[PDB]
Structures are given as C-alpha cells and as structure tokens.
Amino acid sequence: LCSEAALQAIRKKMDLIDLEDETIDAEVMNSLAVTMDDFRWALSQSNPSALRETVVEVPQVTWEDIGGLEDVKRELQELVQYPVEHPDKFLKFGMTPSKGVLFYGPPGCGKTLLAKAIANECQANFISIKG
Amino acid sequence: RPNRLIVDEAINEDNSVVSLSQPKMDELQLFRGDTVLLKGKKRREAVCIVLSDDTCSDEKIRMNRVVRNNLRVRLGDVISIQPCPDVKYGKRIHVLPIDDTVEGITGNLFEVYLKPYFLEAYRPIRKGDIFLVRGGMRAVEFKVVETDPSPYCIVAPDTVIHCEGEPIKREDEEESLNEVGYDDIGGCRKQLAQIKEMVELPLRHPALFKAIGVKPPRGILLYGPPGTGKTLIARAVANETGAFFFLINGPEIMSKLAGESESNLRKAFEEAEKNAPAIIFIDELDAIAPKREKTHGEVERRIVSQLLTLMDGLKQRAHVIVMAATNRPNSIDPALRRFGRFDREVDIGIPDATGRLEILQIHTKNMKLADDVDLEQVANETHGHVGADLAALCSEAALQAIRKKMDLIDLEDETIDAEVMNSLAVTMDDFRWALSQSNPSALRETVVEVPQVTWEDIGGLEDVKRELQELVQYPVEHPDKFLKFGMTPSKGVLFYGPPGCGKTLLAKAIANECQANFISIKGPELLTMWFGESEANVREIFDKARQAAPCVLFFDELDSIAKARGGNIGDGGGAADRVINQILTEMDGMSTKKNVFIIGATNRPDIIDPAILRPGRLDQLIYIPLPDEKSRVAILKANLRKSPVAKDVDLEFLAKMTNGFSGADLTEICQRACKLAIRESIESEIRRERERQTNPSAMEVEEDDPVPEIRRDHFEEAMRFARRSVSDNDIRKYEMFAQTLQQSR
Ligand SMILES: Nc1ncnc2c1ncn2[C@@H]1O[C@H](COP(=O)(O)OP(=O)(O)O)[C@@H](O)[C@H]1O
Ligand SMILES: Nc1ncnc2c1ncn2[C@@H]1O[C@H](COP(=O)(O)OP(=O)(O)O)[C@@H](O)[C@H]1O
Ligand SMILES: Nc1ncnc2c1ncn2[C@@H]1O[C@H](COP(=O)(O)OP(=O)(O)O)[C@@H](O)[C@H]1O
C-alpha cells in the first residue's frame, strides 16, 4: 500500500515534467510529498487477505459507554477481577472460583456491550463466536 | 519549448489526421485543415493534416497506427512539430505493393484500390511513406518509392499515377502494420486501461524505478472464461510497449518425457532473463499447477515446485513481468498466491451488448457489407457469445455469401480476379443463416451488466422512487458529505407487496440510474444450491459481487425456502437454514469501503425469519401498493412504445374501469390485443393470396400490405376475456401486516 501510494504521487508529477529528456536527478521526488488523497486512492483498489479469520483483540468500549446497571457492574467485577488479581487470597481459603455466567433478558439491552466493557477493564482478549 | 507534445491513440481512423488541442493550435497560429510537418525519432519525417478535438489536453496529440509507424515512434514518446504550408502540387507518383500481401490477386490494382482512396481527400504524401488500404477481403499496404516534386506533394485530380512493376521487398525497420494492437480489442476498456497503466510503468523507464526504490509488480494473473481474448491482450501489450514476448504452453511442457520438462522451463526463464525487458506468458496455468488433491502422481509435484522456486528466484535484475492465464481462479494451487508471486488479479468478463457490437465492428472492417444490414440488431440478439464465437460467425457469414457466386469464378485461375471481390456483398440473410446453425458457449454463466430500463418505463410510485434515490444515490455520489459527519449508510432494502407489481423493474431502474452493475439471483437457482448442491456457491457469488463494485445485488423470491420448508417433507429445513446462514455470514462480513447494495424481494412478509430483520442487515421496509390513478396509463404507454397505435379507444376510460389490477394483467391485455391484430392481418393476407390465384394481376388500384392499424373492436374483445389475478384477501392481509408493523413495534 505504501509503495503504490508513492507511485501514484510520482504519476501525478510525471507527464508535466520533461521525462522525455535526461533522467530526473531525484530532486523532483524530493519536492514530491504524498497526500491523504493518494492514500485513500491506494486503499480503494486494495485486496485484503485476512477477511474470514477469527480476530483476537482488546475491545475499546469503556464503562461510560453503558448507562446504569450498577448491580450487574458490581457482580461482573466480583466474578472476574477477584481471582486474577487475588489468587493467593483464594488459595488461603482454598476455593476454586466459578468460571461461567449467563445473560438472559429482553433483546437489545447491552449484553454484548457488557461483555466488551468487562473484557476492557481486565485488559484481556475477546474471542466472539456468533449464532 | 512549446513545441514538443505526447503521442496517444486517436479516435478517427483516417490516415492523414492528427488531433491537437484548440489552445495549442491557436498559439501555433495554425488554422483548421492546414498542412503540417511532423518530425520524430530516427530523423524520420512525415506530412499530415490537423483538425479540432473535444477533450484532448494541450500536451497530447492524437494519431492512428499508420502515422505512428511512419514516424517510427511508440506510445508515450514525444514529437517535434513544424508548420510548413508551402506544399506544391504533384505531377507523377510511383507506388508499389509489398510482397507478402498480394499473394494471388493479379488484376489491375489502380481501378480497385487507389482510385477510391485518393479521390476528394488531397492526401499529402512524402517520399518513403507507407500507407494501408482496405479492399475486398484483404488489407494491402502500398509504399511510395518516388514523387515529383520531391519530397512533398499533394495528390490532385491531374496526376500521373504509376503503379506498374514487381512488388518490393519488405524492409527490416517497420515491424508490420498488420499484427495485433490496441485497436484490435473491443469491449474491455477498463481492464485494458488497468493493465496498460500497470505495465507501462516498469517496461518503459526501468532506471526511474531503480532510482526511486519501489517494488514493481512481479506477477499478473488474468482469469476468465475461455475464448475471451487473454492471449490477445498480452500480445497487444507486449507488441505495443516494446518487449520480447515469449509464450510458454502448458500442454507443451507437460508433453515432454520426465526430467526434460523442468529443464525446458529453466531455459525459458533464463532466455527471457537475458533478452532485455520481456514478458513471459504461461498459458493454461491450471493444466500444470492444479490443486494438490487433484494430483496423484509425482512428476506434477516436481513441476509445481520447480515453477515456485524459479518464481521466487527473481529479485530485481531486468524487469521481467510474468503473466498467467487460468479458467476459473480457484483450481490454481493456493501456494501460488503469496506476496512476491502472482498477487494482482484482473478479471476479463463476458462482453455486454455494446461489447458485442464493438467486436462485430472490429471483425467486419475488411468486408464490404451492403448498405442494408443493421449491426445493432445482430449485436443485441446474440447474448451469450464470446469474442471467438463472433469472429467465427463473421467468417461463416462471409463464406456463405461467397459460396453463391461460384458461377462467376468457375475455375478462373489459381489467382482470383480483383473486380469479383468488389462485386461481393454480405446481406442480412447471410448473417441470419450463420446465426441459425451456431451454438454459443457461455449459456450457464452469471451475467453482469448495466440494465437498460429507465425511469419512464415505470408508471407512478413517486414516494418509493424518492426513497430509493435518497438511500442509494446520496451515500455514493457525494461521499465527502458522508465521510464528513459520521453517518452509517444502510446496507440493504427489503421489498414486499402484492405479486407482479414491478419489484424487478424498480431494482433494474435504480441500478441503471446509479450506473452500477446488476447481478440477479433468482429463486430456482437459490433452491438449486438449497438441495442437491452445497453452500460453497454463495462464497463466489459474494466474491464476484465484490469484484465488480459498485453493484446492486438482487435476491428474488427470498421466501421460496420457507414456502418449500412448510409441508409434508420435513427433511430439508436444514438446507434452508444453511442458505440463511450463508447469506447472513457473508452479509455481515462486508465493509463500508466498498459500495455493495443488497436488495431482497418477497411476497409473504410474515413468513421470513426474524434474524434478517435486524440492524446491520436488511432493515428498511418499503410497501409498494396496488396500482391506481392514470399511472397505469403510463404503464400502457411503456409496453405500447413499439406497438403502433390505439386510435380512438380512450385508454383513460380503461384506466377508470380497470381499478384493482396489477401490471402483469395490463401487459397480458396488451399482448392479447396484439395477438388478435396478428391473427386478423394473417387471415387477410391469406385471403388476398388465395384470391390472387384466380384473377392474374387484376388490381387496378395498388394496395400494399395492410399497415398495422389496431382498432377498438380487438381491444374490446380482448378486454371481455379478462379477470383480476390478485384477490381482495391478499391486499387486506398486506395492509393488516403493515398496520401491525406500524403499531406493534
Ligand atoms: N447501555 C446500553 N444499554 C442497552 N443498549 C445499548 C446501550 N448502549 C448502546 N446500546 C444499543 O443497543 C443496541 C443493541 O445492543 P446489543 O448488546 O448488541 O443487543 P443484544 O445484547 O440483544 O445483542 C446496540 O446497537 C447499541 O447501540
Ligand atoms: N476484442 C476481443 N475480445 C475477445 N476476443 C477477441 C477480440 N478480438 C478478437 N478476438 C478473438 O479471440 C481470440 C482470442 O484467443 P483466446 O482463445 O481468447 O485465447 P485464450 O485461449 O488464451 O483464451 C482470437 O482468436 C481473436 O480472433
Ligand atoms: N409502474 C408499474 N406498475 C406496475 N407494473 C408495471 C409498471 N411498469 C411496468 N410494469 C409491468 O410489470 C411487470 C413486472 O413484473 P415483475 O416485477 O417481474 O413481477 P414480480 O413483481 O413478481 O417480480 C413488467 O412486465 C411490466 O410490464
């Protein structure tokens, strides 16, 4: 992408200069600088190769994005953050914390946003599998 | 120096015209038609006549193939012009044909070729010039050997043309004015432009890439149906840029014995390496590098690995560009697609109606088709043909037209006469006869092309038209106002209403208005990949839609899966849900960079799965109501375009009396009336022909055939045999669902 973006900016300053004459002394290109328009054009005719692949990343949704649900906020914090940050303290009591939770409610109430935010605070990955 | 310009191809096919720009002509104090002297490389000069142009820039000069060959230059070079308006009228000109063009012609060439060419044109010529003339069935090149006064002269009605003597030997400076080039390709403007750009960059000035330090492409993959002209594209590019085109044939390599195949391939690459900037063409790539599972032997693996190693062995040196041709771009070994190997893919699709017309125009340039044929009709009735088929059609038409003249050339001689060629013409009957016994090869292929339906074809439906214009045209025609300010455009629209009201017409109309490609997937095929076949087909359907962006993907009868699902089978519901899973999975995978629009049509809105009805998918609902108002009159005009008349059967009364009817019913009425008119005309013709058998030519007053003159009685009789297809229950069901949609959510 970067290479062809440079090539296009060379193109837009090739015909008007005397390319027919003795070769350019690499100073016109020194005067040449790329622009965001060239990058957009290069992005236009690009062929990505990843596409159908599971993506692993840290979602960027913060708890300010969601409103209310202070109860589920606290419950999810208790479920997830305590074992990872306080393993020795559970080991003192010697209990295995539960690993699992279920969300059920009316459609479109922020379950996906809740999962994204709770993964955001723990600074963890997020593998999503859909129906 | 405001003299030098840049050479580019011209649009006018005359041999003595060069197109400048009006400002440049004005600066050089030259007027229309003034003779000019053009001087190019190798110290060759020629004389020509300038004209005006529409959109040519100041630094570009347009000229055809003959003038470029005479000046001994190529595309993208520069020339120095000079106005020299002191041409003196010539007296005697000696012109001779070339050896390898007149094999078996004899006759007197002056009365056939030269006289029509040199009349009322005043073509300037210069000593040593070479020009090409189209004749009976061949293109003959003539070389001027001497003139008087030397070296400039103008052919005038009073000249002494000498055209006698032996043909002269072809020299070794001009390659030829007969091989392939950019003027021998039609219907592939966009792809040819892409390839031309991408290959003109490295093959002209390698030193610029050396100094800049960027990576030129090292492989180009062309794929398409066989016989669409890929080898021809590569040959044209190689012969125009200037290279050492070196073809490699797949079957030829596979036909060797064991260990010599890879050795031959290695000599091929090393030879192309040490013969200057060259293009290597590999034909039938899938024949030598198929998928790994297809291969069963061991020599195939060795050949594939050898090809891969030699491909990876290219690092800079001479800029050698590798091109390969394959039928369908999935049988190739997936290993041959990583970066540094074949990576850039260009699609060569089947030509549309304009492409077929252009191919026919190209192939019949030598012939002398009579002034009665209509190439537009032959072009637009031959859908499903490729370039090779059209070339074969033209050849067969010529052969048929020349067959019925054997009496004139009975025996004759081994060298056919000349005037007999000019006595030959090809008529529409010959073309139709060649059409009849011809079988195309595309047939079962998805068709992508811009539909021709316009806005006036549809009567009424103003609100739907406005809504489609807002939803489709705005996000694309002014993408700046959408990238500024964060609006997320919708990805789909779902149509629902009574059957036969014109959903397909609206989709085609908006596709035409947006000037975007149209792909239609109909119910029968959709159920074909439902049961029996698999769901892998949707993958390449979406891939092809992505390739030709922008596009308007159309899914017709989306409820067919549910209609077949509900019954007494209960076995294939899994197949229907796989269809929906595929549709959803590649529907959500689309990105906003590309403009792909998905439109679905259905007539049972309450049976569709609610998964599709969701943000991020097909979410807007548009209800097309049952027709009313004198927009059905516009409907009647739409299919009465070609139908001649209606006299005095007021269509407005019909619109008033025919309320509650869809478009299909009205079109049926029009077709029935036309059928009655045809029946009446044929029975009248038969009556006349059986009447003429008694009285021989007893007709004092001359009547031609009855002109199509549809009366009121035909239409009334047709109207008597008419009913309404859509009952009153379906419209009430639709309005009930509309009210439920309005209130429940
Ligand atoms: N705090 C929130 N609570 C509920 N819905 C929200 C909130 N913030 C945003 N939304 C909106 O709700 C919509 C549906 O949320 P989502 O979690 O995907 O639904 P579901 O949990 O049913 O899959 C999203 O498009 C989002 O824009
Ligand atoms: N504009 C055109 N587009 C496609 N085919 C053309 C065109 N002009 C001529 N042809 C014919 O198509 C043939 C191209 O060869 P083709 O069989 O397509 O090569 P390949 O076997 O590599 O596909 C030529 O014989 C030529 O006569
Ligand atoms: N404005 C219009 N309203 C209704 N029908 C029309 C209109 N314009 C044309 N038609 C007719 O309607 C027919 C379109 O039918 P079509 O949409 O293919 O059926 P379906 O609605 O089942 O897909 C065409 O034959 C056309 O002649």
Swiss-Prot record, chain B:
Changing F110R: Severely reduced binding to DERL1. Changing H296A: Does not affect methylation by VCPKMT. Changing D158R: No effect on binding to DERL1. Its main location: cytoplasm. The modification Phosphoserine is found at S16, S441, S681. The modification N6,N6,N6-trimethyllysine is found at K294. Residues 687-706 are annotated as: Disordered. It is found in: Cytoplasm, Cytosol; Endoplasmic reticulum; Nucleus; Cytoplasm, Stress granule. Changing E284Q: Defect in ubiquitin-dependent protein degradation by the proteasome. It holds the Pfam family AAA. Its EC number is 3.6.4.6. ATP 2 binds at G500, C501, G502, K503, T504, L505. Changing R138H: In IBMPFD1; without frontotemporal dementia; abolishes enhancement of K-294 methylation by ASPSCR1. It comes from the Eukaryota. GO terms for molecular function: ADP binding; ATP binding; ATP hydrolysis activity; BAT3 complex binding; deubiquitinase activator activity; identical protein binding; K48-linked polyubiquitin modification-dependent protein binding; lipid binding. Belongs to the AAA ATPase family. It is linked to Inclusion body myopathy with early-onset Paget disease with or without frontotemporal dementia 1: An autosomal dominant disease characterized by disabling muscle weakness clinically resembling to limb girdle muscular dystrophy, osteolytic bone lesions consistent with Paget disease, and premature frontotemporal dementia. Clinical features show incomplete penetrance. Necessary for the fragmentation of Golgi stacks during mitosis and for their reassembly after mitosis. Involved in the formation of the transitional endoplasmic reticulum (tER). The transfer of membranes from the endoplasmic reticulum to the Golgi apparatus occurs via 50-70 nm transition vesicles which derive from part-rough, part-smooth transitional elements of the endoplasmic reticulum (tER). Vesicle budding from the tER is an ATP-dependent process. Homohexamer. Forms a ring-shaped particle of 12.5 nm diameter, that displays 6-fold radial symmetry. Part of a ternary complex containing STX5A, NSFL1C and VCP. NSFL1C forms a homotrimer that binds to one end of a VCP homohexamer. The complex binds to membranes enriched in phosphatidylethanolamine-containing lipids and promotes Golgi membrane fusion. Binds to a heterodimer of NPLOC4 and UFD1, binding to this heterodimer inhibits Golgi-membrane fusion. Interaction with VCIP135 leads to dissociation of the complex via ATP hydrolysis by VCP. The PIM (PUB-interaction motif) motif mediates interaction with the PUB domain of RNF31. This is Transitional endoplasmic reticulum ATPase. It comes from Homo sapiens.
